[PDB]
Amino acid sequence: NRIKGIPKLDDANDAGGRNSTECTLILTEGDSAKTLAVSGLGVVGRDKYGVFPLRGKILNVREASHKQIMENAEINNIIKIVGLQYKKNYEDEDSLKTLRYGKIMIMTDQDQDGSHIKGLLINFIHHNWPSLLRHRFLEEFITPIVKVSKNKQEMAFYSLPEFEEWKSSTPNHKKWKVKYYKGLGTSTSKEAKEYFADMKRHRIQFKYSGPEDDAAISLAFSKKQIDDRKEWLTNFMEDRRQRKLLGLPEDYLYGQTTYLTYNDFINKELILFSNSDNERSIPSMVDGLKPGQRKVLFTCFKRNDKREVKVAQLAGSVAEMSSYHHGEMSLMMTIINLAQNFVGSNNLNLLQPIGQFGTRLHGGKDSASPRYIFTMLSSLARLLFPPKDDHTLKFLYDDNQRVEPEWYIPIIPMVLINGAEGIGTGWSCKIPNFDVREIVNNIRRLMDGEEPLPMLPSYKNFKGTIEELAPNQYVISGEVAILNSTTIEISELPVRTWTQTYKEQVLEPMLNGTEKTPPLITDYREYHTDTTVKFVVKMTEEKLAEAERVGLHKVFKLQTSLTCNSMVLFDHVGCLKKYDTVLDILRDFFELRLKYYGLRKEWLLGMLGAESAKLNNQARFILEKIDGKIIIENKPKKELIKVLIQRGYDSDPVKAWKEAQQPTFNYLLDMPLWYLTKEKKDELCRLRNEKEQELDTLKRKSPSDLWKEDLATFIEELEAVEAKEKQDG
Amino acid sequence: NRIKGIPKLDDANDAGRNSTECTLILTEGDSAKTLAVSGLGVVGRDKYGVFPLRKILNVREASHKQIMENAEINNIIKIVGLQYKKNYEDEDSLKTLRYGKIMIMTDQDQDGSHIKGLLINFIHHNWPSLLRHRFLEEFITPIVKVSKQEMAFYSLPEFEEWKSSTHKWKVKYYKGLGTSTSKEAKEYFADMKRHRIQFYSGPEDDAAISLAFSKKQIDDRKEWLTNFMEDRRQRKLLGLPETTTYLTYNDFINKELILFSNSDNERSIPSMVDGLKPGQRKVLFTCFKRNDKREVKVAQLAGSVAEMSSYHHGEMSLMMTIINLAQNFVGSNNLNLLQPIGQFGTRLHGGKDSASPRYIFTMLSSLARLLFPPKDDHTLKFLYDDNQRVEPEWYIPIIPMVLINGAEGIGTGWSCKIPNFDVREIVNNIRRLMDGEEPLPMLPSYKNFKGTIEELAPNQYVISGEVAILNSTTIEISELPVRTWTQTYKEQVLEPMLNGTEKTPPLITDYREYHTDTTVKFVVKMTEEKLAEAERVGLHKVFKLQTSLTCNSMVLFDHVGCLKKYDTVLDILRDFFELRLKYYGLRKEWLLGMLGAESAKLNNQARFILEKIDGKIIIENKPKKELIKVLIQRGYDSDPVKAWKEAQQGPTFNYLLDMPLWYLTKEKKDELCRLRNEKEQELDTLKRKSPSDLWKEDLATFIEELEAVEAKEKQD
């Protein structure tokens, strides 16, 4: 019959019989993957194929208790289906016939999560029966990464570089249709049948090629090789930097390929899972943002909202425009955190916190619902990230959608303005806040060739002191003063100490005592606002005198230590880098930003010239038509084009320049009839001169002059915004 | 004097001899407390206390152990120094309370009203003599604010009245507390007289509070909602449009808390006009507005729905609404409005086996806008979420969609279950009603269902699968009853037959599976004796291939918004038919005005181009004011489409002068002249057509596409 007790298993009809070696067990990533396999199998495929969905996390055998392994239903279910014995050898075909299935095929998405399942399954087999790996047992199901369709013709590519080679070798490639099939669920049931009719082109086998494979699997999953994984990622990022500089493509694993070594899989596919956590948690040094923050900011820039919108509405826009797929709760926190402006949050919030966005009372947690709070860009956001730089950035693609860039390039190092914090896999980042004006001044000093002045951490509206005990080591202190004997006033808490947390953890125990400590204070009264702290504490005269001799800041927990020893950021090329000082961050930023002001000037020169040429033709066309040199009334379109060509009119110069970066007279004839009137004609003629003067002015300006203009514009708006903030408080 | 152990309380300084003048603000969570703290500042802490409510229990419907194990109520008692057994009928005991007033500060949504009512219920149950005095109050913010000059309104009709004067300044809605900034909170707390409302006026209030929260008054609340919906229905049919200082307890229950219970009904029971719940309508409205010509990711579309329709429910709920609108397996929609491009779930797992929204794609079906014609959108009533225009109250499709894809929902007092019916039968029955004939009876019909559906009695049906005897020991099951999923049948029926229960032996020897993603094939082996015994009992009964379906709870919202129980599906069809026919009259009336304005606009545009070509109009090097005067002197009209749209709610000649110089060329002039003739012919053709003729046109267009779409579906 069939095995009893596994209702989720589609048992192969020949499994557990004479032809068991010809049977293949398909392990799928969840029920949706199993449904795809069922659709392809049809009826003929049900004799030698079995499908079982992995509806849970495969355990890491290497680092799990024997009790968990013996009670794990998922691990045990695989044992029953394949007929595997916990302690056995499978080096002889005699011992290979006790298995109900001759092959195991893992069917997962071609994303990082799917690779994790593949590796964990590989680790489970390697750690219990490394004999099976020796022969052709473990295999994987693969779908083409990209499909191109045109005129009812379809082609498939199994590697992103292969698709790029096709586009480089195929003119009019933009006339086709592009779809990406890394996820299994993207494929239809009809497409599933097509895959299973050509299983040779959708099957890959895992090959054991030596002890290097055992080392690779050990490196990936052994609990003792944590530091080895750090060097594993370190070499990967440097190898990626070298590969890009040498023009070599990204490391591909699948070609138009039938075999994949275990070592190749670990070092080229499973590595991307760990590097993703670093790439998601550690900000970039160029703009101080993580990809999630960048997606929100990119969405805000693209929307160009002149009026505030609900956070829930903006969150929908980010999901729609930037392909954000990391979760609704994460998206909400990212938007809210970009707008917070309380002491210890951003020194310069890029989004406006219009409503209850959290305060210093609860460390930003006391925010209201996203359906009730509003936000929009700050008036400083587009001054910090100038629109003219967008044309020099590298915008990324999520499948077919153009999304946020690799990084933005602000006019001052934003990573030092609002700080940075993140925990990845092997590295961690912690950078404090610094004064906006001091950073602008140091950028100006570097432009003039002077040495940068030292910078201490600075938090906006913080009323306490920050002192440097030693390089990169600081102590942040609140404010306490003795009003009289028996009374002290606490008027400031240290940075990142929240009002509610201080009252609950410090002052309440001193008033009520605990099981191990008698009360220290007799009373305390609270006089806070939403943005200021005031505690008035009463004490016994003798106990206060003792506290002063010890030190009130120490006794009342008004001191916090801050160490700058883990300033780890992604550099402009995508490699994690440990910055020893904030001046090193500023210097690295300065070189890149100065270079991109040169890039902006080159682009502006070409674009302004094209705009001037376009306006030159437009002004001439209107004037010639009024003068009668060109007649368009009741004239054939073909005749009009010939006249325009004969008279030396140019095709759309802006269009020509854009294609030049890699005839059309519509820019002339699309002009409204309004432009024949005197006033509008004069406006067009004036605009022609202004564009020419604009190009001439730019030709006389160096990249540093443009940088100084942007800094001056930003500073003026900064003073206006900050002055208004004080008036409203 | 001092309260100990409640670290979340901001005790008032005078809470004490001045306890009568002390007000305790009870806030909805920490964010509400933050707003109150911001408005209080420093000087406000002398007479005001703030405590955050981090859920009030229903005292009537709860164990007294829980009524003493709930820390939140116990903390409230401790803060306001309340004693359970006390009357406090005079100031003799009112000084035994630590605060003079309890102020409830919540959002102005349904969730906030629930907190307000439950707190009121808490006082009413243990200190009924305390709600008599000026004790319980609520914090109120203006509903609408208009903004370098700013004004505020505490009444929606007052805001509408403001529109009569001059309506663009800038408008913002402040129902949620979090909408107000800290600066605005300070302004509120300065004029606290204008932001505070106080709640007893008779025995009617006691009934109101009792009605809302008594566990025995369930059926009274159902009649309470029934009267509300019927009163609303009559007011809407009559065309009716549906601040103070004090609010009675009875007024709060009957005018504010009523919205909470009907909200569950309004979200779960679909409308009879379009067969949709509000969440589904928001998705469909987003799809119509986007008008995607290419497939889009479900994750991307979900963001668009959140951005465009003010959808504020769960993300998981939104994903399921989109996916369910696209499913096309046996038991799901007979006509899916969205295309399931990818793994959207199948009959194997009842649609639960769908892939991640970032990998599956969708777009409108080619039938969606044939079913929901764009020309009808101008006759619908589109709703507003604060300042954003969103989906309408309902769409008006050309056939009753509620009978096509069925209806299912559970509300508060009512429930809905309607099966699917055949599209062609529904179209045919609609055609019969247009001709004056009686509709034919209709049985439930599910697309691609290979079984049988029989009516035992009115509204009583039996759905059966297919089983065939192959030999003395073998039977094959080629169809399961509608809504029986392959995995659920294998796990619940066939697995126990193979293994047996604890006290019952196995019934079958073996079964083999040969399903596809859309078809079912079980080959079951038994012994000869057990098969013969099964035959005598009845194979459909033995293998559970029959399911009962009763049309006894076909409850839908009518076009006026009142829940109505339909006895037969023909009653739904007749009610739909009358409304749809009326809206075809409404469409013709709108089209007559709009087509006429378009024709007038093109007449001026064609005349303007021809006169410019003929030299009757000169614009070269001419002042704008001189050109405008010539156009008026020659009788040209201001934008007629703008004028007609303005009529439905100096001169404008931009529609003439914005035209490109291309229109002076021969071909474009001929195209403009051809378009001028086409618009006139369109208006003339419409005048000779009745509303029923337009309906028949839409049905024919829909039927042609339905055959094409369904033929391709079979081809795969």
From Swiss-Prot, chain A:
The lineage of its organism: Eukaryota, Metazoa, Chordata, Craniata, Vertebrata. This is DNA topoisomerase 2-alpha. The keyword Nuclease does not apply. The chain holds residues 433 to 1188 of 1531 of the full protein. Residues 557-566 are annotated as: Interaction with DNA. One of its GO terms (molecular function) is ubiquitin binding. The record marks 57, 60, 229-230, 290, 324, 330, 498 as: Interaction with DNA. The record marks 423 as: Important for DNA bending. Transmembrane segments: none annotated. It comes from Homo sapiens (Human). It comes from the Eukaryota. Phosphorylation has no effect on catalytic activity. (Microbial infection) Deubiquitinated by Epstein-Barr virus BPLF1; leading to stabilized SUMOylated TOP2A trapped in cleavage complexes, which halts the DNA damage response to TOP2A-induced double-strand DNA breaks.
